[PDB]
Structure formats: structure tokens, C-alpha cells
Amino acid sequence: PALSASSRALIDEFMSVKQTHAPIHYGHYIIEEVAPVRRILKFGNKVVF
Amino acid sequence: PLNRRMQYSYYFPVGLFMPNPKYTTSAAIKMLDNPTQQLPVEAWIVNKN
Amino acid sequence: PLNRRMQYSYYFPVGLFMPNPKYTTSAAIKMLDNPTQQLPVEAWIVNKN
């Protein structure tokens, strides 16, 4: 499974706080990336591995 | 010939429906609408760039 | 001649309108405005001073 999000709010919450984010919201969700290649993420400067 | 190209299949769902006892696992996400009649429509994924 | 300059062109939008599923990624910033009828009309930037 790759990085998905059913809203941008959950992907902002994932970009901000990596460890304590919300993987499931009320009417949305977000699936983290468990790929064998660690694709480093960047939305501005909020660096998430 | 040692510069081989792996192929990894990636998947993600789009527009599921959550179970009816809806919940949140983190605060500070306030979407200004009805949270019970909330429905996914999209899949905001991340590109290579 | 080894003290050359660069031209890093910058940009920033002014006065965009957010979609009607409005949201927040952080609490503890409470404005005394109508949050659904909110509308940017300025754009505060930083200087180099």
C-alpha cells in the first residue's frame, strides 16, 4: 500500500506529526507507505521519512 | 547489467465507506460539515516529485 | 569574478479562496470571525530585514 489520503487535512496531519498522526478519521482515512523503498516526503520543509 | 530495474506493485483504495460507529483518533481536525453523513470521494496520493 | 550573483525568482499567491470543506490542522488559533464565510484579502510576507 502506498501513501493515500481521502482529504488533504489528513495528509497535513501526517506531514506534521509523523508518529502520533490519525490513520482513520470520521469520514476519511490515510494509509501510510510501507514500501521496500523509503521514499522521503517533503511538503515545504516538513520532512517525513 | 547490474543496473537492474525492480518493479514493485503499489495499490490504494478510493472512496470506501467507513463503519457506522465513526470515530477519530486525533483531535485538531475540524471539518465544517456533518461528520456522520461524511463520505470519501478522492484519493490524494503523492507523486515522485 | 568569483563573487557572482543568482536570480532566484520567487512567487506567492494573493487572495485565493478555499474550498467549502474547510478544515484546520491545528487548534489554539481562535478567531472571532465567521469561519465558513472567511476570505483572504491580503498576503503578509517576510522581508530580509
Any descriptors?
part of a larger assembly, 3 chains, 49 residues, alpha+beta, two-stranded antiparallel ribbon, globular, Major capsid protein (chains B, C)
Summarize the topology.
This is part of a larger assembly, with three copies of chain A (49 residues).
Chain A: H1 8-16, E1 41-43, E2 46-48
Antiparallel strand pairs in A: 1-2
Question: Could you walk me through the main structural features you see in this protein, from its secondary elements to its overall organization?
Answer:
This is part of a larger assembly, with 3 copies of chain A (49 residues). Chain A has 49 residues and is an alpha+beta fold. The first copy, chain A, contains 1 helix and 2 strands; from the N terminus they run αββ. Chain A has a two-stranded antiparallel sheet. In chain A, a hairpin with a 2-residue loop joins strand 1 and strand 2. The A-B interface holds A 1-11, 13, 20-29, 31, 35-37, 39, 41 and B 8, 10-16, 18, 22-26, 28-29, 31, 35-36, 38-46.
Considering residues with a beta carbon less than 8 A from a beta carbon on another chain, report the largest interface and each chain's count. A-B, 28 and 28 residues
Q: Largest beta sheet of chain A, briefly?
A: 2 strands, antiparallel
Q: What order do the helices and strands of chain A follow?
A: HEE
Beta-strand percentage of chain A?
5-15%
Helix-and-strand structural type of chain A? alpha+beta
Write down the Rg of chain A: 10 Å
State the end-to-end distance of chain A: 16 Å
